[PDB]
Structures are given as C-alpha cells and as structure tokens.
Amino acid sequence: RRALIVLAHSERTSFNYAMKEAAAAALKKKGWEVVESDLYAMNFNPIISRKDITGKLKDPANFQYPAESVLAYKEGHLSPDIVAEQKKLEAADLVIFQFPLQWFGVPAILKGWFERVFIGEFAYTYAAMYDKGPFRSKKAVLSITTGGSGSMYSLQGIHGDMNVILWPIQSGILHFCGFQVLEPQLTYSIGHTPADARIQILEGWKKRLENIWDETPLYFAPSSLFDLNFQAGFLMKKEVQDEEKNKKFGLSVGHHLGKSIPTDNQIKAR
Amino acid sequence: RRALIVLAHSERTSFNYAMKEAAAAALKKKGWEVVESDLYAMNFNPIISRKDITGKLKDPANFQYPAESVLAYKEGHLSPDIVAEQKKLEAADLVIFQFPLQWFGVPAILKGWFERVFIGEFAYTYAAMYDKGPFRSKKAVLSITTGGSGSMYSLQGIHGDMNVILWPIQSGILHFCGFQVLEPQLTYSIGHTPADARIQILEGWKKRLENIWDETPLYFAPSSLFDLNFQAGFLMKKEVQDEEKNKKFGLSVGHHLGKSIPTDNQIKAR
Numbered sequence A, B: 001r002r003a004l005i006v007l008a009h010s011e012r013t014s015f016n017y018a019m020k021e022a023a024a025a026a027l028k029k030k031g032w033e034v035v036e037s038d039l040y041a042m043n044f045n046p047i048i049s050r051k052d053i054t055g056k057l058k059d060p061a062n063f064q065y066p067a068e069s070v071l072a073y074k075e076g077h078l079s080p081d082i083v084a085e086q087k088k089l090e091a092a093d094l095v096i097f098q099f100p101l102q103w104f105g106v107p108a109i110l111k112g113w114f115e116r117v118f119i120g121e122f123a124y125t126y127a128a129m130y131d132k133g134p135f136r137s138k139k140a141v142l143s144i145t146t147g148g149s150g151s152m153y154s155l156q157g158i159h160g161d162m163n164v165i166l167w168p169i170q171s172g173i174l175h176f177c178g179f180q181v182l183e184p185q186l187t188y189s190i191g192h193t194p195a196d197a198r199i200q201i202l203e204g205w206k207k208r209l210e211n212i213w214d215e216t217p218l219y220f221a222p223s224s225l226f227d228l229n230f231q232a233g234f235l236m237k238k239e240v241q242d243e244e245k246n247k248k249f250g251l252s253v254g255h256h257l258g259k260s261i262p263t264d265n266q267i268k269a270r
C-alpha cells in the first residue's frame, strides 16, 4: 500500500516532527510507500484566493470561489501547488494528519490546506457525500499533540469533551469527503511529559502502525439513514426517526438527537 | 462604546462584505466608534512562526512558540503587525466576527489571526481562564454565512447539530479568553436566497445591533464548578459532581457529561 503523511509544524526539533519520523519509518518497514506533506517546509500558502486558478477567470467581476475553482479543477487550470497535492491524495491509501492542536482545531496552515485542496468534485459533491464520498477507499487518522491534559478534556474537565472538539474535523472535513476515520492518536500533555515517556509514545505509535490498515474505523451515521434531496431538507427518514424513539443513546456526536452521546464516539471504535 | 469588526472574505461583492458594511453603518448611527480588521484587505499574514518574535530568542536551539511568545509579549518584542491587532482588542468593547463558514470552522486566515493574536497571558492565562479571563468585560459575536441549509445542520440534518460545530469556537477560542459570547447570527443558504430576503437579512442584523450590548450572553458552565489546579486535573468539584448525578440534562455542549445537551445551548441564550 501507500500512505500520505501531512505534518503542520514549523520546527524539525519538535515531538510532532519526531512523531512524523517514527510514522514514516515504521510504515516503510512494513512495505508501504510513504510520501510527505510538511506544510511549513513546502512554503505552503494556506489562503484561498482567485490565485488558486491559473489563467483567465470566467466571471472576474463577481468572483465566486466554489464555482470558479470547480471549473478550474475540471479544466486543469488549478495552481501547480494545488495540483501536486491532489495527485498525492488520490495516490495514497492512508492519510495521517500530524499536527499540534491549536485553538481547539487544526493549525491555520493545515486549515487552509483543506480549503485549497479539497476542491468541489475532486473531494466532495452534494450527490455523493459521507459514505458515498470520493475518498471512501481511503483511511485517515489524526495524531494530535496538546498542551492540556486528557483530564482537562474529559467529560468533567474544564475544556469539555474531546469527542465534541474532534467532531467538526473527523466528521465534517474527513468523513464528508468519504474518508474512513481511524481512531486518533491523542498525545495529551506534550511538553510536560518526561523524556522516558516520549520514547514510549514514539514506540507505541510505531507499534499501532504495524496493523493500522486492519483496524475498525470510528462510527458515523451512514447516509442511508437520510432522504438526501433538497426537498426533504436532508433530514432523517421518518422511518429512521421512528425506530429511534425507543433507543437509549444517540448515534454520534453530531447526531446525538438530543440524547446521550455514545461514549468516546469520536475516540473509540466498536 | 467601541467595536471591532473582523472580516474574512476576499471579495467586495460578497454578502459577507455587505454584512460588515451593514453592521458598521448601524453601529455608527448609535454612537459606536467602529474600527475594522479586514484580513484580506490588510493582506494579513496568518502563519505563526519565530518571526512573530522580533529580537533574540531565549532558547533558539529548541524553539517552543507558547513559552517564547508569552515572553516576547512580556518584553514588548512581538511583531508590530501583531501589536496593532492586540491594541484593537484592548480598545474594543464588542467584537464582531463576520465570515463565511468553511469546512465546518472559521477560514484559515481567521484561524491564523487567533493563533498569532490571542497570545498567552494577553488573551488567556493558566491562572484565569473562562470566567476569570482577560477579556471578561468584553463581548464577542459570530456572524456566519453557509452554503448549506439550516435543515442540514439541525439535530436530524445530515451534517448534525449546529451547536456542536459552534462549541470549539465560542467556548474554546472566545469564552476561554474570557469573552461573554452573544447569540451567533446564523444566515443559512446565503447562496440560494432571494434579493428581497437578502435585504431582510441585512436589515434584521442592523436592527439587532441597535441594542446588542443589552442581550443576555450564551450559557457556559462557570469555572467555579471546578477545581482549577494541576493537582485535581481541572476536573469538576466533587460537590458539583455529586449534585449532577441526578440531573437529566448536561450543562453545556462540551460539558454534556454524557447527558442530554440543553437545546440550542450554543445558539440561543436563556
């Protein structure tokens, strides 16, 4: 197989870059082909503009980025940095996102990466979303490093559930394009962690990569539970809503239905 | 009273730019003083790097942005462009964030604004977070335009509850720094909205601004329910933990405690 490792960190000296080195090494030792996207190292511009389109614009007087970039994608007039990335995504089976958690989401340079690269039709259409998305043959995993401890991010922690903070990312950005999201690698307290524990964290990550492809992905509501048309408002099917009135838990984090979230829905599989 | 409107949109023709203009006009007419942060117009650089620190570094050989950026702030050695922005924050009573929803969060250029601007101790401290934070006497509000419809983001919508997508930003970025967060202004389906309804959206937003400072802010679990120390793990007070065991509903979205989330916690106040 072949994997794509995307890293968002400015320092080669960091544990994030050390986590990338371990992941790249362990996967190569298993016969994977590993290609890298170190956004700071690539001089990556993370800002969507009319400059993502190479040549003449169709309608410059009222520039409309989603419509304009799709045409640019179909016509082959996207900027060479955007092109090179999209080639790597189709080529790869596994995508690992290695980044420091920053302000309760992905870093800005990675946030713009999605915006300039996950272009309409290439990555998603309203005709084929979530289970039906373009990347459904691919698996993607977040490896996150935080300042705060897992206790701060537990249900009773001051920051609130970590499952709710992962939900926009694993559901909205990854799964929406069809990715099967694997259990994230959550490395809490990085920075206040002793060098003997960082060694075991790097080794434990390499050990999980030896069978990453065989793991169960996180659970998301399959799109078949919904009437996927503009006239039904993309709501749940009435039959599906009936069968849920006597169920104790919700389905997912975003689909809690005003019910209890299944525990570690964004963190633990099965 | 003084306001700051931060806009993240590249085109002067956008509904987003019209909403910034609509907000700025109404506020001026009621005696507000309005300063703007038009990120694309300012050519804002959104990328945290060591050049955010002007002079020499404490530990250049092993750069760690949080500890050094706090020091540069304590020393007054932050990059001049970052200072200009913080001064607007100190000056502002109300902060408006006008932006198009992108990949279930803020655009990258606004993601980097937060990362380079909400520096440690200036915007948040480990000693005074949430209700005790540096911005505790200020109010902040989100104004969001989506392609997708309001039904898609309801509890039964294919995208899942909108409150869960609002939780990382309104709690983790805004309230953590101490802001009292007001009800977000949610304009769904802006790209499919008729010209006389586009007018009513603009007028209703101006009308709400005529008394914005008098609105009740959104409900968050106050930090006093917690033991905010490195020794108890920033977990809830045992007394609070006992008194919640018999509650049907959770407190907040991130603090749902495995219970039913209160309806529209991140969208409606009570």
Ligand SMILES: Cc1cc2nc3c(=O)[nH]c(=O)nc-3n(C[C@H](O)[C@H](O)[C@H](O)COP(=O)(O)OP(=O)(O)OC[C@H]3O[C@@H](n4cnc5c(N)ncnc54)[C@H](O)[C@@H]3O)c2cc1C
Pocket: A009, A011, A013, A014, A015, A016, A017, A018, A100, A101, A102, A103, A104, A105, A145, A146, A147, A148, A190, A191, A195, A198, A199, B048, B062, B063, B064, B065, B066, B115, B116, B172
């Ligand atoms: C703008 C910003 C926003 C943030 N927002 C959040 C937030 O919302 N929530 C949150 O929880 N945290 C947040 N943080 C904290 C952040 O997540 C941590 O700073 C980050 O996760 C740590 O990763 P690092 O690679 O920077 O660590 P580093 O400090 O580089 O690594 C930790 C230590 O390990 C050492 N090390 C390096 N290489 C190796 C090796 N090969 N083997 C062993 N040890 C090694 C390093 O030298 C260092 O001393 C934020 C930080 C910033 C700058």
Ligand SMILES: Cc1cc2nc3c(=O)[nH]c(=O)nc-3n(C[C@H](O)[C@H](O)[C@H](O)COP(=O)(O)OP(=O)(O)OC[C@H]3O[C@@H](n4cnc5c(N)ncnc54)[C@H](O)[C@@H]3O)c2cc1C
Pocket: A048, A064, A065, A066, A115, A116, A172, B013, B014, B015, B016, B017, B018, B100, B101, B102, B103, B104, B105, B145, B146, B147, B148, B149, B190, B191, B195, B198, B199
């Ligand atoms: C990278 C990316 C990711 C995205 N992800 C998401 C997502 O996760 N969820 C989601 O829902 N959406 C998403 N979208 C869609 C996004 O929310 C819309 O593109 C945005 O909300 C549209 O706002 P706009 O200002 O561009 O609309 P525009 O098309 O610029 O404006 C709408 C209409 O208002 C008109 N207008 C301009 N000035 C005025 C005026 N004074 N009075 C009246 N009308 C005026 C314009 O001419 C236009 O006809 C995404 C878009 C991008 C680019």
Ligand SMILES: O=S(=O)(Nc1ccccc1Br)N1CCCC1
Pocket: A103, A147, A148, B066, B067, B070, B120, B121, B125, B126
């Ligand atoms: O530990 S940290 O890097 N994490 C951190 C950063 C931003 C938001 C939330 C956290 Br949590 N930091 C806190 C004050 C000193 C440096």
